[PDB]
Design an enzyme around this catalytic site. Sequence first.
Site: not given
Lengths: 417, 417
Positions: B127, B151, B170, B219
């Site tokens: 994350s 995520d 990127d 998550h």
Amino acid sequence: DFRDIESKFALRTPEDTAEDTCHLIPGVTESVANCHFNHSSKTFVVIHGWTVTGMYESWVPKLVAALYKREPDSNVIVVDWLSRAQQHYPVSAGYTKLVGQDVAKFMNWMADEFNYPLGNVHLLGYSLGAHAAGIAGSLTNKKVNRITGLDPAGPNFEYAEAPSRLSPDDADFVDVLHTFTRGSPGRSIGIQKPVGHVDIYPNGGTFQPGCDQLVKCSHERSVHLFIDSLLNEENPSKAYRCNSKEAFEKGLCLSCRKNRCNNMGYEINKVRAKRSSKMYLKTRSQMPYKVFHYQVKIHFSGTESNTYTNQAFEISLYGTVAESENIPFTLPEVSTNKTYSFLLYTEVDIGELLMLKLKWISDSYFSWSNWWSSPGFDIGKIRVKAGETQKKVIFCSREKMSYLQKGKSPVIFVKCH
Amino acid sequence: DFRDIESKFALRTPEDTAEDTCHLIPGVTESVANCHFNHSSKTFVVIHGWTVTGMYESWVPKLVAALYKREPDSNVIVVDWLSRAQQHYPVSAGYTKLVGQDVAKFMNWMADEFNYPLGNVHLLGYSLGAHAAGIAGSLTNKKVNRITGLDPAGPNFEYAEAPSRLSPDDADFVDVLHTFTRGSPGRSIGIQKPVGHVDIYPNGGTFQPGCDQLVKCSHERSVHLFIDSLLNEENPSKAYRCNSKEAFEKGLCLSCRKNRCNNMGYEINKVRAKRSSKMYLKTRSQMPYKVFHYQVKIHFSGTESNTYTNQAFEISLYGTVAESENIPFTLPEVSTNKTYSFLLYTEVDIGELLMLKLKWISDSYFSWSNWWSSPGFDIGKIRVKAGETQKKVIFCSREKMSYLQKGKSPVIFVKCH
């Protein structure tokens, strides 16, 4: 594509220089990490030339130690020949076109698997090894950095094609020594043609002043002049650019401006040129191979117009550090109102010159010879130009003893200005 | 320039996955050959996200084993955070702009000393780790190959600048999972903005059907969907391109032509696009996370024009390999002379379809309910379009039993053409 590589490979350590323990295999990748190939430094590839026995020669276990003393933490790869070189000479003159392809395949494998830069590869070559390294490099994916050839092969490779020998387009920078170029055109042991970007002729290239071990005497100087250049890092041996062998003896070409006067051996400066580049120096018969170079210009003057020939002189050199006393030289066709020049060398360090004797010796020895009044001249000035340190001093005498005469006391010159 | 690298590095082996024995040091080159960095294969860099305890999380010693089982003889580098991540969240939201610079300096060191290609580098990110890998790469000498974000962080990185977050410029190819995007705009745990070249929303991205361990349930699906994609090499889980969450439930967008229907996870195809790319799939609550996708179009026909709502159906699937029996679905606003479509999924492999029941169940249970003659329709055809294997079969019945009626016997359809 990796079973026609019968010319083997090896990697040697500074702790074990005379053996062939850890091999490299093109294609098998468990052995590259077995020999501890350091992927950061440069890589030396030493290609063996001709032989007649079964083992290696005597200079390879010294060149390995010299490379590992000069460039520590590096890579020295020894190529093997001992099932292809022990032949007759036109037999081994055809295997270079195969061994160079094997080395090209090995280098393309290393440059296409491990992403090696091909920017830090030296290719050292002996007499057949230089032509092996020359037929390599042209068959690589891009240009190799530097190929050094040490007295390449002469007979079957002269008069050949440019994609067949060590040509100047084979790499990015190629330097070639020419120690043993004595013989007829096309019948010489070393090659008489200038092939590199820099082409050095030590002592002109006819022979070397040290001549079964005695048979190959002046063919191993191209290795013993390179081991000395690897050992003597702080002291380089300069080589001087001239136009012919006869002009260098007159000393008219000790000029070190506009991309002239390069070094010799490992410490050479990367300077490209437009044509062939013949360069000259002198050497000594022992393990320190450095001599200095001095130019001496002498103004003769007098009244009695009388020409002579083959007169022998003796000169001295008096400087700050040490001195040189009895250097001999000769000059033919001496006469009045001329200006003569020559070349002079020595092996003792001087520094900066202070004084200089000049003696014109007598060939006769008899007790008769004190009479029949000897010829003499009136010497005014001597211009001296040193080789490395470009200083042009002027020497003269006082207004006494300015009369050199044969078989008499020598004149003594001092720093004049 | 190599003492501000306090974010350490480590390299782990397949024989020792849970420890940090052999470190790498930027600048010290005796340690690169100590950890046996194989210079031929690819290199994984796993960046750790946020934590609250002192140790690592529980998914890293499984992801190490999964990478070493899927890609043997490779490189998995674990970045360390444990003096910078154990903070509060706006405190650790500022250290990414430093850790990404540290990783950029490490990669430029590896690409400028050992001449590493930078063409086989995966950047895995959690994350905060995805934004760390995103602020890295922009500060490298050239483009890195692939950055995978699992995520990414939501709160302080939404509404930010493109050189501040994981932007699509990127790298060369960036894929991002969006498992936990529930909440208001700007107040969500995962990021709601599409940021990658490929942006996959599993189950739409609101939550996952499995919800202190129970607190962070949805998550860790962005890691357990990637470990499954590494383990199941032969069986990919396709994800389907649509335009909105509500349209995918109607099944109007199961189209796999013109750069649509990519895979999910490691086996994704490198396809660039012009805009944001939202993609959809469904999952299952256990360790095999693959379900199939079927489209069913139903033609209603009859005589009595009577609309209804919220009717529950039950359908079966009869195929070559196995069968699925009691799949439930509902349809609101059923009426005559229409054509309705929806989406249907299952977890048992079928093969090719043969027959298909269709039952319209009764909500009432009383013994009264057999009377007051039930509503019914006259079903002619069903068009079925499978998800992966693009086959469009047609189903129909005979000229008997073609009358579906609520609380009665179901119709049975066969292969019609």
